Amino acid sequence: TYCVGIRLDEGLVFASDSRTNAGVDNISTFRKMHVFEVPGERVIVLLTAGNLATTQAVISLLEERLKDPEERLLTAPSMFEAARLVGEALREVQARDFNASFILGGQIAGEPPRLFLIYPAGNFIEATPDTPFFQIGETKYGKPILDRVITPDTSLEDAAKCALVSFDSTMRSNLSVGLPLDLLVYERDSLRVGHRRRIDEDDPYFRMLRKQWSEGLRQAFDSLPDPPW
Amino acid sequence: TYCVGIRLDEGLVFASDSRTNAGVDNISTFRKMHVFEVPGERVIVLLTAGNLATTQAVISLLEERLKDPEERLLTAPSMFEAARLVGEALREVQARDFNASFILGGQIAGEPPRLFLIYPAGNFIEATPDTPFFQIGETKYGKPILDRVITPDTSLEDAAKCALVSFDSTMRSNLSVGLPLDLLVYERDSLRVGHRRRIDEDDPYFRMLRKQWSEGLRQAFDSLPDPPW
């Protein structure tokens, strides 16, 4: 479990892995990215982390077919209210280690793109130009590269590269995160899911990326100056 | 608090920061590296992490002037027995969040160089060619670069560079670790502290290193190919 959401002037980038604690001596594959789209009016993306029984129960609550006006993710009047729905659903489930955590972002027509982190307690915060990304799951291995590269001015292409490299480092160093990944790249004001795919162990691009990052890192390392000793 | 110990065919490398929880609204500087040296017979280095009252009480117990034969760190017959002394001291202190943790390494004449990790419970493990380094404190931010570079064949110079880059990434991404650092590089069979120093905010070499790593990493990143779609 590692999920990342990134917010840029140009749009949003989301990525998540699938390796999941599904009970004792059982780690299996479960998708952690969920998309709610009304093409030409809104796109909302939800990433999950923590206890699977809890996340699945939250998702089930948010999809309940006969809810009141403005109380479903598809009909929320703003992303702030959407985040509040996720948080309230989480609290409702907890009143029935079971903790869980989410990242929620997207765009609703006539409002810019926005990005939120929902905490275990069900309160939340919103990304800004100064803190333009969020992470949930096992996050510390992959944070340094995101801190080095991501700014509001970063292009969608580079932010996606940076997310993937972040996953590479995390997967090398911690066995609780693993392929397949989901990747979604959203262009500001499209109001449409533009690019979305699944990246598995055979993906040619992700293989090329890892191999060239590895070769280029080693060259950067080898050209660092020697101590005076 | 971040400390690292590394073991190579050529010798050993130790590094530690100084930013420490010293009570409520008080984070201050305390050195975390302690050296026991009998020049020409042995060198032993101890790195500390966790609760400061606990680590200081462990150190105080290990230095108690009138202990029995082979029961002080300077008179232990092997590094395995030395590690056992640290662990037993830790348990004695805990019978009087107060957890603590240590890295212990060095060389005793007629024995190769060795490196140990002492856990909070006071048991321990020893580094091998396949797992040639240990970390304590906030460790995840810095692990990926150590995993990429360190092998038994790595030179002392490169291992020290790798440790320093590991600290750089950690300090950029987490405010609980901070300068000044301590660095010690030990040559196999010298039985002497060869190189040891303190690295502060102004250190030219550490500045050089951060700046060249940063430039080289960005150029490796920028030459990666863009996602295809």
Author numbering:
A (entry chain A), B (entry chain C): 1 to 96, 107 to 239
The paper states:
In 2008, a novel bacterial β subunit homolog, termed Anbu (ancestral β subunit) was identified. We find that Anbu forms a dodecameric open-ring assembly that locally resembles the architecture of the self-compartmentalizing proteasome, but is not closed for steric reasons. The individual subunits are essentially all in the same conformation, assuming the same fold as the proteasomal β subunit. Moreover, a comparison of the active sites shows the catalytic threonine and most other catalytically important residues in essentially the same conformation between Anbu, proteasomal β, and HslV, which suggests the same proteolytic mechanism for all three proteins. Via an extended C-terminal α-helical segment, Anbu forms a dimeric antiparallel coiled-coil interaction across this subunit interface, yielding a 3-fold increased interface area for this dimer compared with the respective subunits in the proteasome.
To test the general validity of our findings, we sought to determine the structure of a second Anbu protein. Therefore, we resorted to a different strategy and designed an Anbu-1 consensus protein (Cons-Anbu), an artificial protein with a sequence corresponding to the most frequently used amino acids in the individual positions of the sequence alignment of all members of the Anbu-1 cluster. Cons-Anbu was indeed highly soluble and even exceeded the thermostability of Pa-Anbu with a Tm of 80°C. Crystallization trials yielded a tetragonal crystal form with two dimers in the asymmetric unit. Around the crystallographic 4-fold screw axis, these two dimers assemble into a helix with eight dimers per turn. The dimers superimpose closely on those of Pa-Anbu with an RMSD of 1.0 Å, and the only noteworthy difference between the two structures lies in the geometry of the helices, which is highly regular in the consensus structure. Also for Cons-Anbu, we did not observe well-defined particles in negative-stain EM, but could visualize elongated helices upon cysteine crosslinking (Cons-AnbuA53CN133C) as for Pa-Anbu.
